[model samples]
Target chain A: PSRKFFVGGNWKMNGRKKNLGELITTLNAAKVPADTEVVCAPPTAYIDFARQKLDPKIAVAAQNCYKVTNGAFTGEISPGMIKDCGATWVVLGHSERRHVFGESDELIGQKVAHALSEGLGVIACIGEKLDEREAGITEKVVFEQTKVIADNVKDWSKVVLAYEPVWAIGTGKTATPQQAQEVHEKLRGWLKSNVSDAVAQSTRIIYGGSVTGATCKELASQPDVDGFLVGGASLKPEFVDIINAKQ
Target chain B: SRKFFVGGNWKMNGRKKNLGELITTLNAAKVPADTEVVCAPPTAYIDFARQKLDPKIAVAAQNCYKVTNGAFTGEISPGMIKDCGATWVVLGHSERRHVFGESDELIGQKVAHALSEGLGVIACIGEKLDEREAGITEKVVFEQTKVIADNVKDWSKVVLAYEPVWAIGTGKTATPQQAQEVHEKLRGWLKSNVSDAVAQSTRIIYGGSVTGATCKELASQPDVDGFLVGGASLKPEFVDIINAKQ
Candidate 1:
């Protein structure tokens, strides 16, 4: 498999100025695998600032963007705006967007297509809830989410499939490597049978769920686990370790 | 009732190059001294637009979160909006309400948080075509206003915007009479529910299909304090709308 290691640090709603400056310095000084592609999804308001501060080695991304290029959708940042602010990527359908903010699957699909159309790389996320996972339907939930995401992607190169188990995220739980690898393999198999073997082999399926420096190594060791989408740890200096986990 | 307030909600439009040119256009334009002008670029460029736009023309965030900080991914907070040098925020636009599924309580919470954080709120309230047809326009508008009004510790930071859902971005301009009818009633609603001084002084602006062609008559209405320009806000003619009172 030629899938490049993709590491995304979703800053979520955290960050202002002084702290982000220090974080940028840490990111600037760190050296990870050349093949490891690192992207930071900061709060929408801080995209420009983060883009300016972060070194060229690291790319900046907006946490989310609206579906269309531009219109009368108040309070929504469009993919065009995300790109215009010097960000080349956008993280859409993050758990907070799906559960906290009530973004539907159809809306997330539209957002993915528009982001791709506007030439922004999309970190498309999919996961199952606590109950869904406990009910032995993790595959069903993640697969359903993936199907919608798969339908919207015309260019697989610009999209990263991030498998983040909602039950584990922010709940201080880490999905074991066995658990993570099972899901990743299933997703790759889904893409293989549905999309094409080329896309299946080339596409990176990253895992996210309380990913920390302590667990990054084991998780990254999985054959199908391409990389990680770090959350709270992304804001910390240890995010470097998570990126360098494959080392 | 007070100094005319005209806020241009850039909405989800504008990139760096075109916005820079528009900022230059806005910077060079000569607007009335008595009017208060604000421009809300999409949240990503609030700081960028704030830096380039003339200080005379204040910057606003199209919307913001209810709290100062959070784990609400994608949402910007009022403190962040202020940190970026934006002095105002537009809360509860029709698009945010009907299109984005923001509830009345959520918009009210955002208004309260924004005002508490020392940012001016272009708080929007309006009735849909169905509500108006059902003869509950005042009831709908009053209820929406009440949510925001209850959260207001200070009326000085609030500019109530009335954008009828049927009229917004639809090329359907509410005639001057239709616009004034709502503005006048809102002013009276304020007098009845809030206070005499708050009612007399608060600015209730009109939105929804306001353009340079229709601005003069709309501005002429006694209760139409100013406007919340949408699509036209991106154009040079917005300058004309800004000086409507002239």
Candidate 2:
């Protein structure tokens, strides 16, 4: 279990339960390589169906979670509830949640605290915007985002750092391996400086934002880049290939 | 038998598995005869709640579009909600107005648009803490009522919930005098502006911080016909809130 090459399918706001069944069934039939950790974040409507249908090796995640455990927060899903429903992984701080839904890093930190406390693992997403990248602050923006959570969560062992540049997400422009490697290396350096060497060394810093099977190999070759957090392409046939990229 | 009106604001909550649990609980609950219980699950939970909800407990959309439909992404219109098999729509909760920056006229337009498509409305109205303190409760509630008055002609199609913004989720119970005062004011205003019959028949219920402990006294008020419950409405204690009339 040397940081199994992870590939997560984020089926955001897509698929009916029947269609999700077919999607998972398709994944199940694939000759999935054993060296990878496969998971899916289905819409809140289909978490259970995806969980039951997908193989146990293939875990599931909720699209979002609320901070408080239980209350009249209306339309909020809590971390405890997700854990209660048999989902071990929770995807926090996704680009859609950060940019579109207006979730703050402070709130994301709270969610991370709640998720880890509830014995659930986290896919902690962090990245810079186009303006920040163009402004030559991509590494600064990425470090600040990662460092805040790295400051809060002592157990980075259970966390997955997903770097999805806002401009790159759903935009078909990925950070070139050399470009992404630069940030990944800086992220590792930040972890070493701010958190612990063990965490800095052991943590799986995964790349996200428009990752496809074709781009997987070159990105996978980066020393600091551990795996991926796939978005739109995760729903396609190449998802299995992306999941098994390390092979 | 006054339709036993019930509207649950799934405010901002529900998971994929618990969606089934919630629907199952509603389906199994022995809904009172002559009662209409309408639960507004989240936009994400609408279709699932609709398919599994018992016929007795009708389903509602927590919110809907003021317009019919168009190029708005991440937005669900009144028409889209209707297409999803939900018949009732909860329009203008304080959360939408205060947090999301929706206005009185916009809410009115939404109400009109909803009714235009033959959708029923649970229009939420109330005063802020400052307004209540300043003794302008009637004035604030009146202004909101006037907006709806300009658009909604048929009061029969609307269920008014007097959710005092201060009282919502704050655990601050408006004293029986406080609750009755606002509820009665809305009723009186309805009589003056709409019609005596509409005032008498329309469900001008209460919302905000309505826990099982406090709901009984509030439900006993003459003008307090029923409730549009908030935070406490999510739990099984919601059953107690629903049976507050009993």
Candidate 3:
């Protein structure tokens, strides 16, 4: 498989300008792999600052965006606004957005389609709850979530799948590499039959769930695991190591 | 009576460049000293707007999360708005309610939290077109107002905005008499439900397609204390609307 390794840092609802300045310094000084693609999604308040501060090799992403171009929607950033802010990627349908914010799958799908149409790359996330996984319906839950994006998405090249098990995210309990690999493999196989063989082989399906520097290398080594969508670790220096895990 | 208050809700609009130009227009323009002016820009520009806006012109956030801070991604906290030097927030606007489905209780919770963090709230209450058609405008607005009124400890820090949902962005002004009908009834409701001091002292502003051409008449009404200009706020005419009370 020649899929590019992708690591996205989701700085979810954290960091001020001062803290982001230091992170930008860290990214600018670090040596990232040539074959690896990296994106840092800061809070909406700091997207422009990150774009201006971070090295061009590293891309800035919006943590979330509305499905519209621009309108009377208060407290929402538009996809066009994200592009205007010099951010090329948006992370849609994160567990926090789905569970905490009550974003429906249909809404996430609409946003993904809208973002792609506006020329912003999307890291569309899909996952299952602990009970769903425990009840052995993890794949069914994952399938329904992914199908929403697949049915509406016009371009697969601009989209990356981030599988963050809801129970593992920020819970300090990571899925063992094997457990994570199994889901990735299942998703890839589904893509091969349901989407297309080319998309299955080429699309990068990354893992996210308490992914730290200590666990990133093993997760990266999985044949099915492409990279990670790092959460808490992204704010620290260890994000650079996660980005370079492929190397 | 409270000082006449006017707010420009530049909702989900403006880039950094345009915001600077707007600020420059406002800074150089002559605004009446009698009016209290506050502008709520999108959260992204609240910090920048606070820095450049005239001191007399207070800054506000278009919306804020109920919690002070934590794992609610893509949402700004009231503390962050305060840290950005904004003293006010606009809550439960028609766009947030009808477009985004914010229930009255959730808006109340947000109002309580923002006030607890020492941020003044422009607690928005309005009747939808259907609610008004059913002749239940007072009931609808009263319920919305009562929720926030029950949550807030300080009446001085809250401004109730009666924005008729049908009139917002629809280019249909709630005729001065029509607007006064709602505002006066709201005040009466406050008097009966909360306290007479709150009813007498709290400023109840009007929102919904207010323009320079129509603002004076609306401002002249006894109950209509000010205006919440929406689309017009992004344009130069906002200056005219702000000086309507003069």
**Can you tell me the CAPRI class of model 2?**
acceptable
lDDT digits (tens) for residues A136-220 of candidate 2: 8887788778867876695766889888878664556656788888888988888888777877788888888567778888888
Off by over 4 Å in 1: A170-174, B169-172
In model 2, the runs with Cα more than 4 Å from the true position are A169-174, B8-30, B39-54, B59-123, B135-159, B168-172, B175-202, B209-225, B230-246
Chain A in model 3: its TM-score? 0.97
Computed on C-alphas against the true complex, the DockQ of each candidate is 0.80, 0.25, 0.59
Q: Which scores higher on DockQ, 1 or 2? A: 1
Better of 2 and 3 by DockQ: 3
lDDT score of residue B171 within candidate 3: 61
Worst 10 residues of 3 chain B by lDDT: B166-175
How do the residues B45-143 of candidate 3 rate in per-residue lDDT, one tens digit apiece? 776788899897999888888886567778877877776788999999888898878888899899999999999999888877767778888778888
Q: TM-score of chain A, model 2?
A: 0.95
> At residue A53, what lDDT does model 2 achieve?
79
Look at candidate 1 and give me any clashing residue pairs: none
* Model 1, span B1-246: residue lDDT tens: 499999998888878999999999998998787999999888888888988988899998888888887678888888888888889988988888888889998988888888888999888888887687688988899899989998999998889998888665555657889988888999998999889999999998988787789899888999989999888998988999988998
TM-score, model 3, chain B versus true chain B: 0.96
TM-score of chain B of each: 0.97, 0.94, 0.96
Whose lDDT is greatest here?
1
Model 3 Cα displacement at B201 (Å)? Answer: 2.2
